[PDB]
Structure formats: structure tokens, C-alpha cells
From Swiss-Prot, chain A:
This is Putative Rho GTPase-activating protein C1565.02c. The chain holds residues 2 to 148 of 374 of the full protein. It is found in: Golgi apparatus. It comes from the Eukaryota.
Curated annotation (Swiss-Prot), chain B:
It comes from the Eukaryota. It is found in: Golgi apparatus. The lineage of its organism: Eukaryota, Fungi, Dikarya, Ascomycota, Taphrinomycotina. The chain holds residues 2 to 148 of 374 of the full protein. It comes from Schizosaccharomyces pombe (strain 972 / ATCC 24843) (Fission yeast). This is Putative Rho GTPase-activating protein C1565.02c.
Amino acid sequence: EFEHDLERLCFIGGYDNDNDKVIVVVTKNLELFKKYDDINLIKEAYNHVHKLIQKDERYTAVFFAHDSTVFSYLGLSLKAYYGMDYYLHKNVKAVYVIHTDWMSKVAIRTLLSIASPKFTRKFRYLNSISDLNKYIPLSHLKLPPIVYE
Amino acid sequence: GPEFEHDLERLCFIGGYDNDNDKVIVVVTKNLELFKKYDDINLIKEAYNHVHKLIQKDERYTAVFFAHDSTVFSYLGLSLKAYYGMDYYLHKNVKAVYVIHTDWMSKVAIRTLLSIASPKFTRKFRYLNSISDLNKYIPLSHLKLPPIVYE
């Protein structure tokens, strides 16, 4: 019925080689639901996905952007995904976003870069170019004169 | 046109090498004024394109940001925000990111705190450009996939 449109938005597409679930979600198949009226759609989604993952069960999330932006179908899909209970966030092994537009791609990779700490450490802040010579020698390095003014 | 691609090379270029003779690329932060002279163009896009040309898919390298000036913006925060939104590989293959600014804490304070408050949940994420790039982590033979990704 109505329910015969959710299992065109959230499957267990398969299982990893560690024999734990993968959960596929297509961010584009919500316009199926602008035609019903009266449905809350997010509690019903929460109910749906709850029946797909046991509570102490590790899984994997895969989203299909595919002509959705952060202002529609992906912004709403994830923001939903953040309001879930904590165990869903603790049990994921990884979450994969696939094939969105440029704005969403640069916006996504930005927040992971903030999140991923192993990357934010290779930074080292120097007061002037004089101090860089310790790490990268200035005997290499052709530079414009502006870095010496 | 050509003056554009030349300004791009003046903004971000190859500085030199180290050991094991890996590229050390240099980005000058005072040098985004060269693009004010232009009208309609998506700078950040072609800047990503230019950096893609400068270093290939897997190549260890060091990055250096020159932000020692002052005034109404030094655009270190602007070039960093641009750097943070670049392809994941460009984040892994970095040896180090040296950043030449004196009062740098007055700039990276907001970012530092955003990293502090980022939950481990958002850390396990990863974007992939197309469906083919999944294969390494999860095998697709194991999965039934919708007609959207097919012909």
C-alpha cells in the first residue's frame, strides 16, 4: 500500500564479508510521498528502519544522492539520520554518500574534514617564513617576492 | 582566459621538493585579489580543478600556506575553508600543512572548536563520486541495488 513505497527507499541491500548488514537509502525516492496527505512520514520512517536493524547489531549506511542537494532529500534524509537514537550512530561501521551535486559534495567533504582529526593535526602554525626553514629547507622552493616583504 | 590560468598558477603552484623528492606545493593567500578583476566565473571550482592538475591521485606531498599580511582579511581562513572541502585523498596524502600567520589563533579558533564538538558519528562518513568507487570497501556482488544506478 503506502508501505509499498518505503521498501523502495530503504533496503538491506546485502551483507558485508564480516556478515553484518548494509542499509541502502535512496534520497531521491521521497516524492513518492507528496501524494498521500495526513502522513507524518518521519515517525513512520523511524518505525520502518527500527524493524530493519536489531539494537545491538552493527550495520553500514549507504546513501544515494543522485540529483539531490543539501536543501532537499539529502539535507532532510541526514537531519533525520541525526535525530535517531544514539545506538544507531554507535553501531555503524561507516556511512557512504554517493553521487550528489557539486555544492553538496564540497559541503559534505568540509564537515568530515572538520570531524576527521587525523587530518587536522598535520597542520603546524608558524609566525613567519623564517621558522619554516627548520622543516622544509628554503634552499629548494622558488617563491614570489611577496613572501619576503 | 589565459590570463586567468596564469593568475591561478600565481596563486597555487609547485614550490619545490624534499625527501623522498615529494612535491611541496605553495599557496599564497594574498593572491586572491588577482581574481577580483574578473566577472562571472566559479573560482573555487577551477581552483579545485587546478589543484587536481598539480598533484595526482596518490602522491605524498607537503602544503604551505603563506598568510603573513594583514588588513581587512588575510583569506587564510578562506583558502583553508576551500582546502577543507577538497577530495578526501588530498587530505590523506599530506605530509604536513605549514601555515605562515602570526596571530593565527584569531582565525582558526572557530574551526578548532567545531572539530572539538564534532561527534564520532560524522567521522565514519565518506563521500564517493559514483557507484563504482564503492567496490573497495563493500563488495557490490553481495548487494541488490535499485534501478536508479543502472541503465
